[PDB]
Amino acid sequence: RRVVAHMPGDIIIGALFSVHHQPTVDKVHERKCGAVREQYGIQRVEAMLHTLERINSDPTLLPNITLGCEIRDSCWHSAVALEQSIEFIRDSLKPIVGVIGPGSSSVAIQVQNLLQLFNIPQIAYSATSMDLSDKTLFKYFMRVVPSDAQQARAMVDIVKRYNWTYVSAVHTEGNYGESGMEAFKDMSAKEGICIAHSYKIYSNAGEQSFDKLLKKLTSHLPKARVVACFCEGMTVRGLLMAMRRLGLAGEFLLLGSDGWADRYDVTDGYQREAVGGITIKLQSPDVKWFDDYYLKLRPETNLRNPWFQEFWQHRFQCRLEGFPQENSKYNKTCNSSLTLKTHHVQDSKMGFVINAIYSMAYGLHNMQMSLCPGYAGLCDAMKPIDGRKLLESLMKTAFTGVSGDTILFDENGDSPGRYEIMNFKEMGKDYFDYINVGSWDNGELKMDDDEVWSKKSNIIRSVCSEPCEKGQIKVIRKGEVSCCWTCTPCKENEYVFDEYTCKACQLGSWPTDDLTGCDLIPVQYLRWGDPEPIAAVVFACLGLLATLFVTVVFIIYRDTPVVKSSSRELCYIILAGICLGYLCTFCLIAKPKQIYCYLQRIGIGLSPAMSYSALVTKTNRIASACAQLVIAFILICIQLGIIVALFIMEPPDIMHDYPSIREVYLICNTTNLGVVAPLGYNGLLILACTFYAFKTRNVPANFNEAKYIAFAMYTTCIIWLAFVPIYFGSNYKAITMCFSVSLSATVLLGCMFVPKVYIILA
């Protein structure tokens, strides 16, 4: 059947080493595992077979007693290792104190499920899965290697450090790859990372299965250029084989895991397809004394290792004619000159196997010391070794590993460990070698980006969408994933509220530079320096000059008999009204203020009433005594009363009008009704003036001035009728107001004031 190593002794420690390769996908039911392995097989077998002798020669460990082993073979298969463990326990149905757990995590789970039935403590050296840390189900399981939650954290840190966002994930079926990828998915998709799609594949699947997997991987080729591989060594070897077969020169950047580590048997003959890969390897410096013992081994003298002969044939293809394992398949015959020195690699996880066996030895030594402190041997109270006591002792056995540091088992039976971020690279032509470019110990990732990517043209950033943080362009995501977005800009009215939202601020406002925030529009008023305002104010100035000139001339010629027909105050109140009109034009052009707008309203109400009440008195009186001032002031006072009514109704306040979202101006609260009320008032005044104008328009005067009053009436009537479209049609509004009122003030002067003075001076 399956041969087994032997080493008789007082206490027997079983072991489970993957001596042969996993059974091929066809021979699974026969459980006929395949070709031999050096590193995971013979090297570990000889490591145990020599560390037991190193312990035995040591009197400080297990004095006066002999430690023995029964090394079995697990073929990296749960089904095979279960049956080998059954062979372990058949004696309990020499007893076995414990085993050194199998390398595979799923195999370790399968073995533990049976070992805990017989209180047989199991120590593992590579079973890195998290699921084994649950002491409720796996009480008798311990390991000198940290869980792979730390490994998932390390990979998340790696992809963080390289801007990688849209990665792809492959993991082998089982419990190591499955739980590792679950943890990585958690701590990545939580923070910022994005897995394009998660894939699974058995290690021993056929070539076509890897072909299909690589087709699915190349489906996302342009963007997901990074593959996060929680994959055992053989899975990555299969992936490289598929990469070669279907013609890929290494478009991807494989991101390996503890399975890949820095093994040379996963990238032998397929180096060109793996250049640039980044792997994670547990730090374990090579054990010197094992190398010095192993390199001298020869197939003739080594007889306690039944798998050494077939391995020796397999390594140097040859035939051992003088030994029973002929294996005539190899044509040639090897001389007594082939040595293991040439192309010798000691695996990474050798310090772990040695440390695990040393942990078992120290647990047994502490048990012996505690149970029988006096007796320096096999005390009669410890001959039936109780499993539970040994496990309890093992849980707290701190010692010094062959590496040099101290080995402790925490509450979950793990042990602290660092990491060494390897990086496959092509140092020389036809020459590739794993190179160390980093570290990771308790959340810290030190990794120089110079040995890796000795340039700035690194791998294409595995990013779904390029950043678009340039002003208006935001990001939107339809239904695919939170990582791929189609950038779109929103209107200039709005600014980016967040990454995924841009909202416009209120009517009077504007987004800031680069749309970072929003700012109020700088409001502007009717500027003092501008062609139309300057023209208006100069017009007001010249009109004022003329008006006070007329008042002065009137005052100096106060009692001239020809003008002793109308009231002296009448052609003084008309001057006053024209003066308030000019003051209204002057005060219209200004920053709109409460007092200022009140001034505008009161002037617009009062000035037209003042001057034209004189006309009303004239046309009525020509048709008595001196009460014409009274009959004008009654109309003026009712005008003041109504204007106070609207003024109380519409108190003066300033609002920033919004003709458009771009522009804002500041005005006061004169509304359409509030401006049409005095406009209608003046229209009624003009209607009454016309209703009294006919006879005055026809009856001449001494200086035929009634005719000039008539044309002044017609001109002011037409300028008043045509005014409405200019003010309402145009958005300037204030300019129309000032120009119209100023012109209406001028026209009455130009027909009556000049002729009287002109004749008087002549």
Ligand X SMILES: N[C@@H](Cn1oc(=O)[nH]c1=O)C(=O)O
Ligand Y SMILES: O=C(Nc1cc(-c2ccccc2)nn1-c1ccccc1)c1ccc([N+](=O)[O-])cc1
Ligand Z SMILES: *[C@@H]1O[C@H](CO)[C@@H](O)[C@H](O)[C@H]1NC(C)=O
Q: Which stretch binds ligand Y (CB under 6 A): 320-328, 470-478, 606-614, 698-706?
A: 606-614
Q: What is the DSSP string of 641-654?
A: HHHHHHHHHS---E
Structural tokens at position 159: 């992809």
User: Which position among 745, 749, 751, 752 is part of the footprint of ligand Y (CB under 6 A)?
Assistant: 745
Tokens 């200086």 belong to which residue?
Answer: 703
Per CB under 8 A, contacts with its own copies among 23-82 are 25, 28-29, 78-79, 82
Q: Are 388 and 96 in contact (CB under 8 A)?
A: no
Q: Residues 631-637: contacts with CB within 8 Å, 24+ apart?
A: 632/570, 632/573, 635/609, 635/685, 636/606, 636/609, 636/610
Q: Among residues 35 and 541, whose Cβ is nearest to ligand Y?
A: 541
d(CA 161, CA 226): 13
The pattern of x and - marking residues 635 through 674 that bind ligand Y according to CB under 6 A reads ----------------------------------------
Give the Cα separation of 428 and 235 in Å (integer).
27
Between CA 40 and CA 619 the distance in angstroms is: 127
Binding flag, residue 507, ligand Y (CB under 6 A): no
Judged by CB under 6 A, which stretch of 7-15, 361-369, 528-536, 715-723 contacts ligand Y?
715-723
Exactly one of 138, 162, 362, 409 binds ligand Z (CB under 6 A); that residue is 162
The tokens for 559 are 């009692």
> Does 586 help bind ligand Z (rule: CB under 6 A)?
no
Give every CB contact of residue 660 below 8 A, 6+ residues apart in sequence.
none
Judged by CB under 6 A, which of 31, 86, 94, 163 binds ligand Z?
163
Q: Which stretch binds its own copies (CB under 8 A): 310-318, 403-411, 696-704, 729-737?
A: 729-737
Binding positions for L-glutamate: 40, 105, 126-128, 176, 258, 349
Applying CB under 6 A, which part among 301-309, 533-541, 624-632, 719-727 lies near ligand Y?
719-727
Task: Say how many C-beta atoms besides its own lie within 10 A of residue 169's C-beta.
Answer: 24
Cα–Cα distance between 287 and 624 in angstroms, integer?
A: 135
Q: Does 90 bind its own copies (CB under 8 A)?
A: yes
How do beta strands 420-428 and 431-436 pair? antiparallel
Give CA separation, 548 vs 558, 578, 639, 712, in Å. Answer: 15, 10, 26, 20
When asked if residue 741 is in the footprint of ligand Y (CB under 6 A), the reply is yes
Distance, CA of 661 to CA of 156 (rounded, Å): 48
Give the residues lining the site for ligand X (CB under 6 A): 103-105, 126-129, 176, 232-233, 258-259, 349
Question: Rule CB under 6 A: which of 671-710 touch ligand Y?
Answer: 675, 679, 682
Q: Which is nearer to ligand X, 157 or 232 (CB)?
A: 232
Of the residues 10, 38, 83, 392, which one makes contact with its own copies according to CB under 8 A: 83
Site mask, its own copies, residues 123-142, x = CB under 8 A?
A: -------------xx-x---
Least Å distance between CB 162 and ligand Z?
A: 5
Distance CA 388, CA 370 (A): 14
Q: Is 719 in the site for ligand Y (CB under 6 A)?
A: yes
Per-residue DSSP letter, 40: I
Helix (H, G, I), strand (E, B) or coil at 328: coil
Q: Is 506 in the site for its own copies (CB under 8 A)?
A: no
**Residues in contact with 93: Cβ distance below 8 Å, sequence separation at least 6, in sequence order:** none
3-state secondary structure 341-375: CCCCCCCCCHHHHHHHHHHHHHHHHHHHHHHCCCC
Q: How far is the CB of 633 from ligand Y (least distance, A)?
A: 17
164 binds ligand Z (CB under 6 A): no
Report in angstroms how near the CB of residue 608 gets to ligand Y at its nearest: 3
Is residue 161 involved in binding ligand Z (CB under 6 A)?
A: yes
* Rounded least distance, CB 377 to ligand X, Å: 37
Q: Which residues bind ligand Y (CB under 6 A)?
A: 607-608, 611-612, 675, 679, 682, 716, 719-720, 724, 727, 740-741, 744-745, 748
Q: Which residues bind ligand Z (CB under 6 A)?
A: 161-163, 449
